[PDB]
Design a binder for this molecule. Structure first.
Ligand SMILES: [Mn+2]
Ligand SMILES: [Mn+2]
Ligand SMILES: [Mn+2]
Lengths: 494, 492, 492
């Protein structure tokens, strides 16, 4: 599931004060930087040099162009020289693409023996970016600020990380979610204001009768079903029962039909995320399981029980990710053994095989929930490593993003009676403290779980989107966490 | 409705002795007794004790909370009744509250008035000290001033009773949604959790398939009996009186009506929604069936509009008479000196607002892509009415109320396959619509002949939401200003 | 003076989804936990199991009951399984009792060999308590949250401490203060809004003429006075000139009349706290001293100079306390010796003997303040140990609770000329910084000192009462403290 070709516009500020020659040197420096950056594979998207801007008219034009350009995912601005910031007001009011203020300098060191006035006029970001910094603060603009020399690998990795965050925000603005059925009845945290969500994030979330999907599923050709089954056998272990014709294999074959129906429905409307609900399965033989797991492994957002917020978050995080292993997740049960406290996460069927440590196995087991036939699903253990667990909730008058940093651990023991894929992890700073913090922030039971998204990225996304982001990690103290929630509350209100 | 009652609670104090307190109790008992003899009141009064200590006050407020029949509490300070004693109970009370500022005797007995009289009949100041604690605490309260035998006073009280019972119904209201919101529509979206917190409404989704199963279980005998009732209540189109396709269309609505009814009763719902975008397993869009359930007093909202469905149900309860419908502004008549709005829906207008006698008709309806639906066709009556919409502003709800005058049509509308009503909105079409749009009023409404503006304002007061009114006194420039000033008030 | 018994209601959330058999195991688990907890002596009050709730009605009913039961001091809720949180909205709107969310699990470990879908459906507090956590945050409920296994001793400690806090809050809601005389003239910090405090905390604070107390004292029988004197002799060292007959025994006898008169007045009115004032003592032979010190030893709240806020606070902390040693207190003078900085605390007369480390002696000395005769009082040195010093002030629009953690120390020198009881402490993080933070927070000069109340309890109480609680302890830096005062202020 691939992306339009995003790029990043590099805009360099200056002024006419010092003459035309100085301006040429500024332009030369900026082209060199863009050229050099583009050759570094740390960056996942190209930079494009978008000129030296020196007048209010220039600045506004490039902001206007950035807004209208679908491939422009973000703008990086750097004042090479002093660039009077009243000139930037028109542009900053216009721009609605994510903005990064790069505070840098072409040369690394001061050339002591030769530094003179011309040099001082030329290499003066030291004050040019401060004046630009002021107008940003003054206008209350959302901005990433990065400080450092432009060949410093730390600086580059921060830009590169930000690029993925900025791209996910472009995807967010155009995200379409399809709901097959409504929220699980009586459930609170999965409910919310869709209109409010479309305003804050750009998400278009709309409902379809399950019958609309049943229709697509009934148009699936058996030939394609057969091919898909072959692929299943190449990629996964199959339970012995399903190896030859008979009822177990027919159940697997049914999920194959569901997978193809979904893929078709979702592609036809250009949806990149979807929800189902076990409370509305009219005309289906099974709750989608294997089928949803496969679609998640291709990067679709998914949320159980009509949970569109998590479905959206899962898709965003898939785009943010610089690597494998992102999934819809739900905390299921705890292990409270002193000195070895952990959480077992899973869902009744739907966990993404990208987080798997072991070769996934196709199994068929009864599932009374939903009152349908025994669904086929992938069963596997999650891998180990540092990860984030994130939930996005609706507080009524605004949204809150909650992120827990965790460490997934390998299971030491088999769970042979457990028919679902699952993962274990120890939340930071402890089970007790993170759970308490989580509950105090009202974090959901559904999350996006990812080995490949960082806390900084989620916080950057929240800035772009104009919402609160709270983090629970190794440094968290519950008492300070509570105060922060109160103080953040007054700030984000209204 | 369930049985409802209203608690009269009289305040006093121990200062003037035990005999004084017996006299205030006699007065309070007599008032309740006389009130109960008057037909103006839709529910009975219950005399609760005279309360004179914080414990008694708190105890009666707790009981009112626990009592499902108690729809509201009417409080009156017969004598001075030190208001700190009232803090505890007011902190606890979750039933609507009316402060009746009244007096047993109407006139000052000039020739005999003495200090005993002055100690006993001093609501003039007792109710003011109580009024302070109400304001000081920010209690939502209705305040009525006048003598307890004044017909205006009783009439005000009786109307508030209806509002308070609507509120009690609101707090237990269950809506069933068959299918989701019409796709891409904004005004009918909103936060169900927020709504359950604010009004008590329970809004939950079911597959259209859940309803189909019910419709399929309908007794064919029951259908035939219902089909006959139709023949008796309505003018059926000629083609429909004989066996044939048309009569079969009418028969389908009968099955739909019976299946809906059964579903609703099973889950004790009093409002429901449908959407034409999700009718898998259905032969037609519910039409005639919805119109009848609306006549029985069910709330309904088209296109998954749960806010409107609940509003419709609420107003059906507030109403002291006939004629309450889900409604949508469909088209304008901009003829100078005769501007009006024609309201209707695809099918679903309530026959309780009919002037004429409803005709059962069958016409093609391309919306939803199902078979020709049977429905009741009629003209709406004439009269003063209200048209109300309840919207979600993101952080809070806003109730919007336009006062209007319904008018009988002067020209026939022979090609128009749906029931309709015509109204002239106060103060004019141009200003009413401008105000409605600035307030973000919805296209879906509840239209009623039998609900007053006062009632809707009292309900909004009970629920803790803004109520914006558009009437003959409305000026748009002023109106715009008040939205701003209200905004800063109701903003959390 | 003795504390009413209370209980704690344990309610467990579940749902119908998994069938009746799973609901039976939920109930079995919950019964087992309540039974096992009630065997554990760490809990000062019992749990009562109050059903597994699975519908909006059940949830609503049990919160309504919880509200109306005077024996119920708190509710402890645990979602054993997923328990959809819109069902909880109605009950949460109803509950005014303190609420603790216990995030626990019946089994401590995952049974790796056995775990299957049944187990996953049953023991899913991991997500059920999160959905529940959301609705509490979404609705802005004041809640204590405790996480860990139900057999973890630390978990049980936390629940236990909170039980005492919750019981102090119940007492708070019914607390009645008697004031004998007004505030000391021109004093600011002891003044406040009594109405606002009754709304916020529940306290009833009312004034009586000193003459009222005087009538009670005059009614005391001399026989009782004689018996009280014998108890003085048995509990305390009496100054030798006081054991004989004469003026100073007569002075001790006069304090015993006051004690008995006071005790009788307070009991007749159900008061559990009181204030006196040296400026209004008409009819009294002495400023109450020994008398007050004895009432405080019984657990009565006291505040000097008409200070009702501290009197109330002292009483609440007496209830909160899980051990001996709680007193009204005033910083009187400093010791600025380098490396040995400390505060000497005392009052005119009134320091509770429960903080004493020496056996109190009954002594008689002149007191010019008040213009009355030489009062008898108890004299002693307070003991060493970690404690808190707390003040509650009125900022005009809201209350602020201020708590300083301190370390009481043994005096190295006798104070032979000092006629009052006293205690020395070293405030955290240092005298200089502590005092600066205290003054910035505007903390009173009158406090409640206690060896037996934790900061966590006072913080939990403030949360129950909906007020700011500022803590000054070893970690305080003044600059950071200033910031938080500003940020808290915008929130509150
Ligand atoms: Mn789930
Ligand atoms: Mn419509
Ligand atoms: Mn003092």
């Amino acid at each position: 599931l691939s992306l339009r070709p995003y790029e990043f516009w590099f805009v360099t500020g200056s002024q006419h004060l010092y003459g035309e020659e100085a301006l040429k040197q500024v332009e030369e420096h900026s082209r060199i930087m863009v050229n050099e950056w583009n050759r570094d594979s740390v960056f996942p998207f190209p930079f494009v040099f978008k000129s030296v801007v020196t007048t209010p008219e220039e600045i506004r034009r490039v902001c206007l162009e950035a807004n209208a350009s679908e491939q422009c995912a973000g703008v990086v601005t750097w004042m090479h020289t002093f660039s009077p910031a009243k000139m930037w007001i028109g542009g900053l009011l216009e721009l609605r693409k994510p903005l990064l203020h790069l505070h840098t300098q072409f040369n690394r060191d001061i050339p002591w023996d030769s530094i003179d006035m011309d040099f001082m006029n030329l290499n003066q970001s030291a004050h040019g970016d401060r004046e630009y910094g002021f107008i940003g603060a003054r206008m209350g603009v959302a901005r990433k600020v990065v400080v450092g020399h432009w060949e410093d690998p730390e600086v580059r990795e921060r830009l590169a990380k930000w690029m993925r965050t900025a791209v996910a925000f472009a995807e967010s603005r155009n995200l379409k979610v399809a709901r097959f059925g409504d929220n699980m009845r009586e459930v609170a945290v999965t409910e919310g204001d869709k209109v409010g969500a479309q305003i804050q994030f750009g998400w278009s979330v709309n409902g379809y009768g399950i019958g609309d999907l049943v229709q697509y599923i009934r148009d699936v050709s058996e030939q394609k079903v057969n091919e898909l089954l072959d692929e299943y056998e190449e990629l996964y272990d199959i339970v012995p029962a399903g190896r030859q014709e008979g009822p177990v294999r027919e159940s697997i074959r049914e999920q194959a039909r569901i997978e193809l129906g979904l893929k078709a429905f979702l592609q036809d409307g250009n949806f990149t995320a979807f929800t189902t609900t076990f409370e509305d399965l009219h005309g289906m033989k099974q709750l989608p399981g294997l089928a949803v797991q496969r679609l998640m492994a291709e990067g679709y957002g998914f949320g159980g029980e009509g949970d569109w917020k998590t479905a959206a978050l899962v898709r965003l995080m898939k785009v943010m990710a610089d690597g494998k292993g992102t999934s819809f997740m739900e905390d299921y049960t705890y292990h409270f053994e002193p000195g070895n406290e952990l959480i077992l996460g899973a869902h009744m069927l739907e966990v993404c095989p990208t987080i798997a440590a072991t070769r996934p196995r196709v199994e068929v087991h009864p599932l009374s929930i939903g009152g349908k036939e025994d669904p086929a699903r992938l069963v596997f253990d999650g891998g180990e490593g540092a990860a984030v667990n994130a939930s996005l909730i609706d507080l009524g008058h605004r949204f809150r993003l909650i992120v827990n940093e965790v460490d997934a651990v390998k299971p030491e023991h088999d769970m042979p009676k457990l028919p679902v894929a699952r993962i274990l992890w120890k939340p930071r700073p402890s089970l007790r403290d993170s759970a308490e913090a989580w509950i105090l922030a009202g974090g959901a039971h559904h999350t996006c779980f990812s080995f490949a998204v960082t806390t900084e990225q989620l916080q950057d996304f929240a800035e772009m989107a104009g919402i609160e982001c709270v983090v629970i990690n190794e440094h968290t103290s519950v008492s300070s966490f509570k105060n922060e929630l109160k103080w953040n509350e007054v700030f984000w209100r209204g």
